[PDB]
């Protein structure tokens, strides 16, 4: 669609800046469990994607995604309500543009949640697995979101992903969980992206687990790559919405409903957690 | 290619339904070892893909063969669409979704695969009990794109993708028919291809828990499972994968075809005998 | 861009053949040599109709042999198509290339590797290829090769043996390893988790290039010699403060790598 180059991203950023006076410091990509956080944003300005020229379009059953501006724990945020998952067939530019817009809008930290299957056998339903690293299967293939001409305006041709999941933010998130009595739910792990949209087969899960993957999802990494590429610090957490089935004999099967259910059930806690992290961001 | 949506798929199915009075309950995708299967089909009509508007075209044209096999109404796909050929997701998906509309409840598919598992012998049958969809994991899943809701859910689970009941039946059929010793169950990994796997790739795949490696089938399986078609899939081990970079052994497509053809009669009989035994 | 079929490749080859009399026997792709080939004819890509543009084809003699040096690669992470990446290699085939020598930069996965080490590729793991981004995906160009190429001895064992002997006799055999190159489509460097996974996949070095060219080369019957310069040691622990294209390691080893290539070419069998 529209190339996530500086010209287009500026155009979109400027259109947004006309619509809100909130200069976001924190971008929040609303994933599993963050539905309430998005909702609890203070003094919020809600801008439907449909109202932002050249902003990529996505919907939940026809309802446009929204950019939500306002504050959260006294910090200025922009919340993306409505993501651009690659299994939907969105282009690299589509996925990248909103993140690069965040960059120009002033976002310094991106916080993202997602739903993931627990590969690591110690994980429990409802666990939070803070991403400390990832395995970008599509990226290792030739489906890295950065494939194509590099937009030098945003980042370097060969971005390193050394400390992609900012260790300081991870430490803070863990501390906030600990201080608030749910440190036991919080783990740190390697998230592997399956392009999807099929859930992983038991053989695939077994393989991924053996690759050193703790959780598996179909999202997030592309956004993270774009965020890191343009120098936005990233905090990302997977909500373990289901325990990956490694056994082909099992009759138990992953399903989006239980994924949604776990997200819905953990939303209040995840909101509290994110709000309390935001409150303590440097 | 034309989108494998319900409107287009309906149109194709409807055109086909005007060409045959046979409501197939079993879809068969002929892969390695399934050459002489079309012959065994009775009350059969052969519909060249060329005769079906908006049906994908592949090679002589591919044929949609309807008729009765072992007392059961079948549609047999003669000519498949392999992703390494550059076919689109929609192209590969449409025939399976057409099968769905035509009434197919079970998809039976054979393919040729390299034997990674070191206990496999040339000419063995490896019933797929699971798969590793390397292209799918890497963002080339056949279902990438808007989900066609008339067919299935956005995020299909693949848990019993290779129907355990069909697998059990296939194994029982092989055993009672004296070739149980040829039959394994294993994990099929898809290499997009069209290169055979390097020794290093094979070693990696074997260590990933893969028993056989092929360049086909998974995309159809995914589409079949997405739209609720039960799947039975078997790989004929047409060659033993070479894991050793120092080895002079190597896959050869002619030998692969030869091995497949050699097993064709047995594979046919097996499929026929499985179909005969399917619950009615 | 233009389909890397026999017609288009012929057009380009024929064109190049008007611009030079040099029939190359060896094709060379330097990643991390061309600056020093005798009686060199420097052909800018821009001067070659239908030829991909990013860039020079440098024809001439190297260590007594006619070579074509490809200066300027087409990397998949750049968004170049399969046909674009393949065409230069198929052009080489048409030009007379029988041996392709390629060097590249790679991260050292194998823990025994040191910065500046040479890892001769003896095999590869084509992650994009396994995942449906194989350069050969699409109609097979039958004039060049078969539909399903085997990749047996893809990294010609005799050439590897020779390269090792040359390194040995020239007193830098200590630097030379052989191993498996895995391609990450890129352009991101691999995360520690990814490196760990790749290492455990049996990968010794990781880069973002080369395999597609090698695949095309093998597809059309060109012998391949490929070496990775270990330009950095892959970080496997996400807890480290250590990947950067600022490297540099290539500059350090440039003259050595170049001398090695020259000396290999010197010893190559000649029909
Ligand atoms: O098990 C899963 N696999 C992939 N994505 C997911 N999103 C939540 N659960 C899963
Ligand atoms: O060894 C193989 N690898 C990939 N596909 C195949 N089809 C038959 N044998 C093979
Ligand atoms: O560590 C690496 N990864 C990918 N490509 C490379 N080229 C130089 N080093 C690397």
Coordinates of C-alpha atoms in Angstrom, one line a residue, chain A residues 132-150 156-165 167 170 188 190 210-213 221 225, chain C residues 76-79 82 126-128 131 133 183-194 196-198 200-201 208 212 236-245:
Chain A
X132 CA 13.6 -11.0 26.6
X133 CA 14.3 -12.2 23.1
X134 CA 12.7 -13.6 20.0
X135 CA 13.0 -15.9 17.1
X136 CA 11.6 -14.3 14.0
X137 CA 10.9 -17.3 11.8
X138 CA 9.4 -15.2 9.0
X139 CA 12.5 -12.9 9.3
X140 CA 15.0 -15.7 9.0
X141 CA 13.0 -16.7 6.0
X142 CA 12.8 -13.8 3.6
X143 CA 9.8 -12.3 5.3
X144 CA 11.5 -10.0 7.6
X145 CA 9.4 -6.8 7.8
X146 CA 12.6 -4.8 6.9
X147 CA 13.0 -6.6 3.6
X148 CA 13.1 -4.1 0.8
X149 CA 14.8 -0.7 0.4
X150 CA 15.9 0.5 3.8
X156 CA 20.1 1.5 9.6
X157 CA 20.2 -1.2 6.8
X158 CA 21.2 -4.0 9.1
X159 CA 19.7 -3.3 12.5
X160 CA 21.1 -5.3 15.4
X161 CA 18.5 -6.7 17.8
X162 CA 21.0 -7.1 20.8
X163 CA 18.9 -5.7 23.6
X164 CA 15.7 -5.5 21.6
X165 CA 13.6 -6.2 24.7
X167 CA 16.6 -5.1 29.8
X170 CA 12.1 -5.9 31.7
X188 CA 10.8 -14.0 30.9
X190 CA 12.0 -16.2 24.1
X210 CA 13.6 -27.6 21.3
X211 CA 14.8 -24.4 19.5
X212 CA 14.7 -22.7 22.8
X213 CA 11.4 -21.0 22.4
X221 CA 8.1 -9.3 16.3
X225 CA 11.8 -4.9 14.6
Chain C
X76 CA 17.2 -10.6 -1.1
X77 CA 16.8 -8.4 1.9
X78 CA 17.0 -5.5 -0.5
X79 CA 13.8 -6.7 -2.1
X82 CA 14.5 -14.2 -7.6
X126 CA 18.7 -22.2 3.1
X127 CA 16.1 -21.0 5.6
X128 CA 14.3 -18.8 3.1
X131 CA 10.2 -21.6 3.8
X133 CA 11.4 -18.3 -0.7
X183 CA 21.1 -17.9 5.4
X184 CA 19.0 -15.5 7.4
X185 CA 17.0 -13.5 4.9
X186 CA 17.7 -10.4 6.9
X187 CA 18.3 -7.6 7.0
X188 CA 18.3 -7.8 10.8
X189 CA 21.2 -9.4 12.5
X190 CA 20.1 -12.5 14.4
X191 CA 19.0 -12.2 18.0
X192 CA 20.9 -14.3 20.5
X193 CA 17.9 -16.7 20.6
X194 CA 18.1 -17.0 16.9
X196 CA 21.4 -20.2 19.6
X197 CA 18.8 -21.9 17.5
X198 CA 20.9 -21.7 14.4
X200 CA 21.9 -25.9 17.4
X201 CA 20.6 -26.4 13.9
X208 CA 22.2 -13.0 4.5
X212 CA 20.5 -18.0 -3.7
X236 CA 24.2 -16.1 21.9
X237 CA 23.3 -14.6 25.3
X238 CA 20.7 -11.9 25.3
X239 CA 22.5 -10.6 28.3
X240 CA 25.5 -9.4 26.4
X241 CA 26.4 -5.9 25.5
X242 CA 28.3 -6.9 22.3
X243 CA 26.5 -7.1 15.9
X244 CA 27.3 -4.0 13.7
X245 CA 28.0 -3.7 10.0

